[PDB]
Design a protein around this ligand. Sequence first.
Ligand SMILES: *[C@@H]1O[C@H](CO)[C@@H](O[C@@H]2O[C@H](CO)[C@@H](O[C@@H]3O[C@H](CO[C@H]4O[C@H](CO[C@H]5O[C@H](CO)[C@@H](O)[C@H](O)[C@@H]5O)[C@@H](O)[C@H](O[C@H]5O[C@H](CO)[C@@H](O)[C@H](O)[C@@H]5O)[C@@H]4O)[C@@H](O)[C@H](O[C@H]4O[C@H](CO)[C@@H](O)[C@H](O)[C@@H]4O[C@H]4O[C@H](CO)[C@@H](O)[C@H](O)[C@@H]4O[C@H]4O[C@H](CO)[C@@H](O)[C@H](O)[C@@H]4O)[C@@H]3O)[C@H](O)[C@H]2NC(C)=O)[C@H](O)[C@H]1NC(C)=O
Ligand SMILES: *[C@@H]1O[C@H](CO)[C@@H](O[C@@H]2O[C@H](CO)[C@@H](O[C@@H]3O[C@H](CO[C@H]4O[C@H](CO[C@H]5O[C@H](CO)[C@@H](O)[C@H](O)[C@@H]5O)[C@@H](O)[C@H](O[C@H]5O[C@H](CO)[C@@H](O)[C@H](O)[C@@H]5O)[C@@H]4O)[C@@H](O)[C@H](O[C@H]4O[C@H](CO)[C@@H](O)[C@H](O)[C@@H]4O[C@H]4O[C@H](CO)[C@@H](O)[C@H](O)[C@@H]4O[C@H]4O[C@H](CO)[C@@H](O)[C@H](O)[C@@H]4O)[C@@H]3O)[C@H](O)[C@H]2NC(C)=O)[C@H](O)[C@H]1NC(C)=O
Ligand SMILES: *[C@@H]1O[C@H](CO)[C@@H](O[C@@H]2O[C@H](CO)[C@@H](O[C@@H]3O[C@H](CO[C@H]4O[C@H](CO[C@H]5O[C@H](CO)[C@@H](O)[C@H](O)[C@@H]5O)[C@@H](O)[C@H](O[C@H]5O[C@H](CO)[C@@H](O)[C@H](O)[C@@H]5O)[C@@H]4O)[C@@H](O)[C@H](O[C@H]4O[C@H](CO)[C@@H](O)[C@H](O)[C@@H]4O[C@H]4O[C@H](CO)[C@@H](O)[C@H](O)[C@@H]4O[C@H]4O[C@H](CO)[C@@H](O)[C@H](O)[C@@H]4O)[C@@H]3O)[C@H](O)[C@H]2NC(C)=O)[C@H](O)[C@H]1NC(C)=O
Ligand SMILES: *[C@@H]1O[C@H](CO)[C@@H](O[C@@H]2O[C@H](CO)[C@@H](O[C@@H]3O[C@H](CO[C@H]4O[C@H](CO[C@H]5O[C@H](CO)[C@@H](O)[C@H](O)[C@@H]5O)[C@@H](O)[C@H](O[C@H]5O[C@H](CO)[C@@H](O)[C@H](O)[C@@H]5O)[C@@H]4O)[C@@H](O)[C@H](O[C@H]4O[C@H](CO)[C@@H](O)[C@H](O)[C@@H]4O[C@H]4O[C@H](CO)[C@@H](O)[C@H](O)[C@@H]4O[C@H]4O[C@H](CO)[C@@H](O)[C@H](O)[C@@H]4O)[C@@H]3O)[C@H](O)[C@H]2NC(C)=O)[C@H](O)[C@H]1NC(C)=O
Ligand SMILES: CC(=O)N[C@H]1[C@H]([C@H](O)[C@H](O)CO)OC(C(=O)O)=C[C@@H]1NC(=N)N
Ligand SMILES: CC(=O)N[C@H]1[C@H]([C@H](O)[C@H](O)CO)OC(C(=O)O)=C[C@@H]1NC(=N)N
Ligand SMILES: CC(=O)N[C@H]1[C@H]([C@H](O)[C@H](O)CO)OC(C(=O)O)=C[C@@H]1NC(=N)N
Ligand SMILES: [Ca+2]
Ligand SMILES: [Ca+2]
Ligand SMILES: [Ca+2]
Ligand SMILES: [Ca+2]
Lengths: 388, 388, 388, 388
Amino acid sequence: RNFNNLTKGLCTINSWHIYGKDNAVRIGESSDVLVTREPYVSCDPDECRFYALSQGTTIRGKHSNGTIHDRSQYRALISWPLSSPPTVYNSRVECIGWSSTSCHDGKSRMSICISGPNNNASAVVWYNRRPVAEINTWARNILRTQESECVCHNGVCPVVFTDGSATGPADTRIYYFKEGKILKWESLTGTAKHIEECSCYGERTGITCTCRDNWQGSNRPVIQIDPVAMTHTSQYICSPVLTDNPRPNDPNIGKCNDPYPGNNNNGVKGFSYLDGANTWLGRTISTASRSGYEMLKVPNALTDDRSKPIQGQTIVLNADWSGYSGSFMDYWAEGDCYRACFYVELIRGRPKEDKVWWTSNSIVSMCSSTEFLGQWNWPDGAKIEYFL
Amino acid sequence: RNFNNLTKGLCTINSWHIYGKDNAVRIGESSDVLVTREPYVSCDPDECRFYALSQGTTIRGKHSNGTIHDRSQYRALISWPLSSPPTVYNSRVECIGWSSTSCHDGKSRMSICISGPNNNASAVVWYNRRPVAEINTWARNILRTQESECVCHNGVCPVVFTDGSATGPADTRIYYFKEGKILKWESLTGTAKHIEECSCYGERTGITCTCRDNWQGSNRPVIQIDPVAMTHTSQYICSPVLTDNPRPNDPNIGKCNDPYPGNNNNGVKGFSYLDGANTWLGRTISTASRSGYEMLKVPNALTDDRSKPIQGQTIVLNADWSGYSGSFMDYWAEGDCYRACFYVELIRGRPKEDKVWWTSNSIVSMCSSTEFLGQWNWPDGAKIEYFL
Amino acid sequence: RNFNNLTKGLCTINSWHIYGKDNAVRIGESSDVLVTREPYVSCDPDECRFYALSQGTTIRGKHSNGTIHDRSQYRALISWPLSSPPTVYNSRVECIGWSSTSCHDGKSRMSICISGPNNNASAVVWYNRRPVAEINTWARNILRTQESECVCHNGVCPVVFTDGSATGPADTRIYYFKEGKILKWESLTGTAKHIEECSCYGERTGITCTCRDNWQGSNRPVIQIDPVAMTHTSQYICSPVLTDNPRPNDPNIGKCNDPYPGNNNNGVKGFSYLDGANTWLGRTISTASRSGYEMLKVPNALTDDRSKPIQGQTIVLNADWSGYSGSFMDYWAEGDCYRACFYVELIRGRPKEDKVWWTSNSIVSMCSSTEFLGQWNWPDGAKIEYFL
Amino acid sequence: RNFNNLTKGLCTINSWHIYGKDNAVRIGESSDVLVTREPYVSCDPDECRFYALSQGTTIRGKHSNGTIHDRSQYRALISWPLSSPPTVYNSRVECIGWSSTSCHDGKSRMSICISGPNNNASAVVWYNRRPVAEINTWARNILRTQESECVCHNGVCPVVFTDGSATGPADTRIYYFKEGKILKWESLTGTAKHIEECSCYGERTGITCTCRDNWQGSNRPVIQIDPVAMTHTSQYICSPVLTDNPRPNDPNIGKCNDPYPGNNNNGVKGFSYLDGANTWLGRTISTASRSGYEMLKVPNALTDDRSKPIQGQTIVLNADWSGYSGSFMDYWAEGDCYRACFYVELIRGRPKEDKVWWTSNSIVSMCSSTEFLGQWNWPDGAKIEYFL
Ligand SMILES: *[C@@H]1O[C@H](CO)[C@@H](O[C@@H]2O[C@H](CO)[C@@H](O[C@@H]3O[C@H](CO[C@H]4O[C@H](CO[C@H]5O[C@H](CO)[C@@H](O)[C@H](O)[C@@H]5O)[C@@H](O)[C@H](O[C@H]5O[C@H](CO)[C@@H](O)[C@H](O)[C@@H]5O)[C@@H]4O)[C@@H](O)[C@H](O[C@H]4O[C@H](CO)[C@@H](O)[C@H](O)[C@@H]4O[C@H]4O[C@H](CO)[C@@H](O)[C@H](O)[C@@H]4O[C@H]4O[C@H](CO)[C@@H](O)[C@H](O)[C@@H]4O)[C@@H]3O)[C@H](O)[C@H]2NC(C)=O)[C@H](O)[C@H]1NC(C)=O
Ligand SMILES: *[C@@H]1O[C@H](CO)[C@@H](O[C@@H]2O[C@H](CO)[C@@H](O[C@@H]3O[C@H](CO[C@H]4O[C@H](CO[C@H]5O[C@H](CO)[C@@H](O)[C@H](O)[C@@H]5O)[C@@H](O)[C@H](O[C@H]5O[C@H](CO)[C@@H](O)[C@H](O)[C@@H]5O)[C@@H]4O)[C@@H](O)[C@H](O[C@H]4O[C@H](CO)[C@@H](O)[C@H](O)[C@@H]4O[C@H]4O[C@H](CO)[C@@H](O)[C@H](O)[C@@H]4O[C@H]4O[C@H](CO)[C@@H](O)[C@H](O)[C@@H]4O)[C@@H]3O)[C@H](O)[C@H]2NC(C)=O)[C@H](O)[C@H]1NC(C)=O
Ligand SMILES: *[C@@H]1O[C@H](CO)[C@@H](O[C@@H]2O[C@H](CO)[C@@H](O[C@@H]3O[C@H](CO[C@H]4O[C@H](CO[C@H]5O[C@H](CO)[C@@H](O)[C@H](O)[C@@H]5O)[C@@H](O)[C@H](O[C@H]5O[C@H](CO)[C@@H](O)[C@H](O)[C@@H]5O)[C@@H]4O)[C@@H](O)[C@H](O[C@H]4O[C@H](CO)[C@@H](O)[C@H](O)[C@@H]4O[C@H]4O[C@H](CO)[C@@H](O)[C@H](O)[C@@H]4O[C@H]4O[C@H](CO)[C@@H](O)[C@H](O)[C@@H]4O)[C@@H]3O)[C@H](O)[C@H]2NC(C)=O)[C@H](O)[C@H]1NC(C)=O
Ligand SMILES: *[C@@H]1O[C@H](CO)[C@@H](O[C@@H]2O[C@H](CO)[C@@H](O[C@@H]3O[C@H](CO[C@H]4O[C@H](CO[C@H]5O[C@H](CO)[C@@H](O)[C@H](O)[C@@H]5O)[C@@H](O)[C@H](O[C@H]5O[C@H](CO)[C@@H](O)[C@H](O)[C@@H]5O)[C@@H]4O)[C@@H](O)[C@H](O[C@H]4O[C@H](CO)[C@@H](O)[C@H](O)[C@@H]4O[C@H]4O[C@H](CO)[C@@H](O)[C@H](O)[C@@H]4O[C@H]4O[C@H](CO)[C@@H](O)[C@H](O)[C@@H]4O)[C@@H]3O)[C@H](O)[C@H]2NC(C)=O)[C@H](O)[C@H]1NC(C)=O
Ligand SMILES: CC(=O)N[C@H]1[C@H]([C@H](O)[C@H](O)CO)OC(C(=O)O)=C[C@@H]1NC(=N)N
Ligand SMILES: CC(=O)N[C@H]1[C@H]([C@H](O)[C@H](O)CO)OC(C(=O)O)=C[C@@H]1NC(=N)N
Ligand SMILES: CC(=O)N[C@H]1[C@H]([C@H](O)[C@H](O)CO)OC(C(=O)O)=C[C@@H]1NC(=N)N
Ligand SMILES: [Ca+2]
Ligand SMILES: [Ca+2]
Ligand SMILES: [Ca+2]
Ligand SMILES: [Ca+2]
């Protein structure tokens, strides 16, 4: 086996087609399905799998009570076969913790989980299913990472971490791993003012990450990483099509180098594909809450502070709950280009649906098509009343 | 690995022997068995598996309520080991959608699922477990396909699609795929007047598909495909042994080039093996409803408008519910001929059994023997009262 | 891979050690464990597995009601990992039917299942997981076979079948298969007067089968098969240590060539290892019912009509229910001799425990040791009251 | 494949990081999780797995009643994927019995299970999943072994057994196996006065086992084994940091060659890593009961009868139940040193929590880091009240 190199451009995105959906909450009403949140998708050279943070209980289990909670000793990164639900019997534990990332370099998979109390957390880096390196908290305030897949080039896999405040300046680092070993780390540079939960993808130009500014911004910060030189820059998506949640209404002029103001101390993990005229942005439909999901074709969104949509696709109706979203691609697929993909976390339960005492999710996932395909909408599909 | 070529004739069919049966509804009374419908069987070079459209819920789950419904966002093509039931824990999702086909070409498997609203549906073509091609609706009226396996020759796998009315002229296309890529498509030609849910098999002569005329005909339309030239013809089974359901009583003269009249706007997926004196037709025993199933040896049924049975075998008693039926063969088995096989869907629940609120099925499957074997009958075997 | 040859003698049997136990009924009180009966054990070159006839329902499922029944359309031969219980999720279906045998020839496994009504049953012979040959009933009276593993030599695998009365002369045939194909069959010859449910093992001398005379005999008939010449002989175990159930008390003179009288029209599947001074016989402890199980060292039991035990080992206490027992060996193990093994079916439920409406079993299995090991006893271990 | 050789030293231990945790009791509240106790961890060259003694019932099953019991016919050594819980559907049975050890030699795994009544127990030694050797009780008083992994060097795998009193002098033997065959055994020599449940690890110096003196000592006995010469010595950990439970308070002078007095006829399985200045000891926090767990860096603990801690890490808070603990390492990991690892059994149910009628456990596991990582605590996490 050889390390994968990022040698192709993105395929032209003219629409999105259904890729996967697990209907986990529907099935878990009467099956041993693990409570999860913060899911993602990641491919190996021979298989693509769903990933998420388990809560160490099933949905019907009495221990599902209180699972709105973010960080406990009972969480772990698990993976399971594409479009199956995360069950007790089919889920593989990658590592123990409450914040994660994972990616395959072409030879083996690296998985990283962070665990610990708020003031003493640590990352353990696994490679080929063995622990290889460990990183202690540097700011003693909830060391945390991407919650979706990392990306590798010629064996080098960059990962973005943040340690420090969720509501002010924090200490973000970009780590460069190879075979789970730390090659290098560097402090965040550039104009992004707050960085959390980066969603990344790679192509011949380099690695692009779209992140969450949890402090002042409702535009999304972007980190662009050169995995060969092991350097990066940062800024914001310039477009006035704002893609954080909650967020103000779309103005006519965005901000390239500072947070767009209006909503403080909140946000959601999200993603984009920034590729000139082939640029597509994801966002919740609601500006107030994690509901609905849409894709919008916004040419040169990264660099054009006046850019507006020229095409779109609804993924989840505004009437339905969404949640986290992130990017992944099958780097090992056939063809001359990388097909852009994404997932949307469909959160059910608390805080929005409080007649149940749990919080979980299901997953829907799409990839791009060069066709102009008809659109459907993709709800979680569970009826909360059945759980009462 | 090499692409499979269709180089053999059919084995002589003198009776049918039991091949597989999953007892899914019996077991699902107290196990996490997925609600399904539209099942089939398909072989890989090293394994044969059951396939069906899941409804994204188990039978005992409260979400089984309403599963008479044909098209929802919670359906997916799943496969699972031969004669096991389709469980949450053993089912592999092939793709997402509510109409499907799947076949192995000798090297890898192609699976096709259609999803979307009635007026904006699309097919996604998967090959070696990756999405490769997409096809948008051309008539904006429930794009739909075979609901049983396709067949390949030297890497070319033809698939029959229909888009348009279920009760009048529609737009049927034959697509020719290789490694999931579209080589060619063509509009239906010949004398078949309405085409749905083709059941196909291959042999040295070419590929033969027996379909459902949902409009005016109670005889079955036939499409014969040359996978090398990538051309086809169509007509009806000439025999007065009528094999659609519901249907009129058998006359003494059938129709080769037009629907045999009596029942409009209905039908069921079915199959036949058309092989001169070795011809066998499948049909429900009832002329009114999906109950019972029998095989009838009808020499030259395809071409002889006077042909009647000379031998038969009851598969499912008239007193027991049947449903869809279709053809498959193990193209990778040893020997000098291809052994004809088929499955029968045994539908339980709605609309016929309305004391439960779900609709599901189990599977029975047979293959041919050159012996003259004794016959049994093969009911689903579940007692509906247990589910109340 | 090469066909296995029987080139070794039996290891010296000085005691029996625990080999496997699945505790299926205990676990099935609260897990999705399939109802079974007629279990056995059989080895592949790389794995040994448990086998049994499923009833197509779990124990806790309502369809377990009535499973005392021997022959239904919902039965199948299943296999599952050694000492695990037969669950819905881990059981592999080998073929469909209500009487079976199975064995590996060194290259692939042959499995045979019989299904059908009493007067029209048929065997389907599977090889490398594909149907290869079929055999129709020859006496139209419950065609039936071993219910434990067959044995192969240089690709030839003999199997004993019976068709006809359970209470008078019947038509027994020995079939010789290779790669699932029928090489030859022959009618029973020799002095055995009634043959059912043969338990077989192989060694350099040939294949030895210990069977059940259901008609007049309480001594066990023996068939000795030469798999090279494809011929056989038959007689009874000469020893007055009688090993059928029910049975008279042990006399001082047994019968070599005729049934030992006292109990008619009943019996149980059992086994022995006939090896001169290394001979061990299995039997229920009770003479009246299927309770208890013991092994007895009876030198030259096959040929000496005065032979009595000189050593023994209790396997299951008389106070505990037993059932069928049969032989198997790991022909692919290391060393200079074949280690004798056996299983005992531990039947729970009806007819002996009629407060439940089901009949199932668990399995215990032992292999021989050249040590003189201490003995324990091995009950099923389930408490019937828990199922009420 | 080649036999593994112990060619490296221990990595420098500066802290411990989370390795695995199965949350078995939490999940088993509503899933088919087997009741277990006496768990451990052991690695193959390509996978690391959890091990334990099943009780042949799930936790929610009615047969969980009475599982405080140590030795029954329904126990077996099972293994299952790292950090998954031991379920009916994912657990592999290694052998049948109520005391065990298991280890991989680089080519295949040896597993040993002891079963039988107190006065007639026997060990069966399995190699590459086949029974190879058997050992009868030599003192007729609960033949018993390590309850955690053994260690191999160049194919030789030493195992410590004890037969005889739990409250006075007993007969301890060290057996040396290769491919499951007995090379040699020897009686215990040295100054250890009572030996049970040895926890072992290997490195270039040889194999080191830390055991339980159940008779008079609250310091732990140590056996040091040379697997090449196949010889051993024994003594106690000299340190006044006492690590058995229950135990007296830590004095200022320990005992090298005799039991440290204060608590008789009790103990718990435990472990240590004895490596000069890199020495770390594990122990329960409570001196009275199996609650809490901590690691303490005690330089030269083995040889220095005045040695005290200079660093530590809490693993489980005193308020939470612990239990057995033992050592394992991934001998097949990359790098120049062996990374020390351990597990802690977290016992729930009886005798400490008697509102339920069962006894089970979950597992937490850690490995060493050369970093000085922040510490968390790792409770079982289940709420007993949910089981009422
Ligand atoms: C079968 O399936 C197919 C395939 O899916 C379906 O076809 C799809 O239909 C959907 C729904 O209509 C389309 O999505 C929308 O796309 C438009 C963009 O396209 C329009 O505008 C383009 C740009 O025009 C501008 O520039 C051109 C330069 O050439 C200039 O000519 C023009 O005058 C103007 O200056 C046009 O080019 C384009 O025309 C083309 O396409 C037409 C078909 O769409 C075709 O008919 C034409 O011939 C031509 O080919 C077209 O006019 C997006 O603007 C739109 O997204 C907005 O609206 C949705 C609600 O629907 C909202 O959720 C979005 O967020 C967004 O609107 C918000 O943001 C805006 C930007 O800031 C803001 O301006 C809005 O006020 C609004 O903001 C508010 O809401 C948000 C969200 O809550 C909030 O954050 C803000 O604060 C604020 O409150 C849709 O994405 C697909 O593109 C289309 N696909 C295809 C291939 O056709 C088909 O319908 C299905 N069939 C059936 C029967 O069902
Ligand atoms: C153990 O197992 C074995 C193996 O399974 C069992 O043996 C099987 O038994 C079954 C049941 O009887 C047989 O199935 C039937 O086969 C007949 C066809 O065979 C008969 O007719 C043949 C043709 O005769 C014609 O041509 C010849 C030319 O040579 C000429 O000589 C003759 O005079 C006539 O012109 C005969 O050749 C054949 O004889 C041979 O076989 C005999 C044994 O079967 C043997 O004894 C002979 O010696 C000789 O070897 C034999 O006479 C099918 O016709 C029949 O199917 C019809 O009937 C069933 C109901 O049973 C029905 O469901 C079918 O749909 C069908 O009838 C409908 O359609 C017809 C065609 O349109 C129509 O005419 C009917 O009126 C009827 O239509 C009505 O119902 C349908 C359905 O609801 C509806 O759609 C219509 O609208 C309308 O309302 C059976 O398939 C097996 O062939 C046979 N197998 C073997 C190997 O023997 C055995 O019984 C078991 N043992 C025990 C103890 O149980
Ligand atoms: C720790 O574990 C170890 C290992 O398991 C335990 O040791 C085992 O203990 C068991 C139980 O005692 C033994 O099983 C019994 O074996 C005897 C056979 O051995 C005895 O007889 C031998 C033959 O003697 C004859 O020939 C010799 C020729 O040399 C001659 O010298 C002698 O005088 C006589 O002519 C002796 O050689 C043998 O001695 C040797 O072994 C002794 C230890 O056993 C040792 O002390 C000596 O020094 C010497 O080394 C010994 O005396 C079997 O006969 C017996 O089986 C019968 O009894 C059981 C009930 O216990 C019954 O279930 C059996 O079916 C059978 O009896 C029925 O059938 C008979 C034959 O037809 C019939 O005659 C009986 O009347 C009876 O029939 C009735 O019941 C049946 C069944 O329901 C029914 O069908 C009939 O119709 C009728 O109603 C046991 O198998 C093991 O051999 C022994 N193993 C070892 C290695 O020692 C140890 O106990 C454990 N420790 C503790 C503390 O628990
Ligand atoms: C984020 O995470 C990090 C990483 O985990 C956290 O940092 C960790 O903090 C914990 C908790 O404090 C530490 O564990 C303790 O370690 C001490 C040992 O270190 C102390 O002592 C060292 C030795 O000093 C002696 O020798 C030196 C020679 O140089 C001499 O200079 C000195 O004067 C003295 O003679 C010191 O070297 C060491 O200093 C170093 O480290 C300091 C930080 O720890 C640092 O500040 C310094 O600058 C320097 O670098 C330090 O002073 C252990 O002693 C202790 O374990 C005892 O106490 C715990 C309870 O906390 C108890 O459970 C243990 O069993 C044990 O005490 C029992 O046994 C003793 C021995 O017999 C006995 O003497 C006691 O009385 C007691 O016995 C009683 O209880 C037991 C148990 O029930 C019973 O059996 C008996 O019978 C009896 O009843 C802890 O293990 C970590 O080492 C530390 N890790 C690191 C890397 O710093 C950090 O806190 C987290 N941050 C936040 C904000 O939460
Ligand atoms: C796409 C779709 O809904 N196909 C239908 C099919 C269809 O309604 C008729 O053929 C008419 O066109 O028949 C029905 C049927 O059971 O008769 C099952 C199919 N259900 C599913 N494939 N899911
Ligand atoms: C085909 C069949 O039904 N075989 C029977 C068998 C049989 O009744 C007797 O041997 C008499 O012929 O005995 C019974 C029995 O438990 O005694 C089990 C078998 N049950 C099953 N194999 N399913
Ligand atoms: C064979 C056996 O029963 N071993 C016991 C062990 C034993 O009782 C003591 O060490 C005294 O000898 O301690 C107990 C214990 O939890 O203290 C667990 C073990 N339970 C099991 N291994 N199953
Ligand atoms: Ca924000
Ligand atoms: Ca019709
Ligand atoms: Ca008898
Ligand atoms: Ca002690």
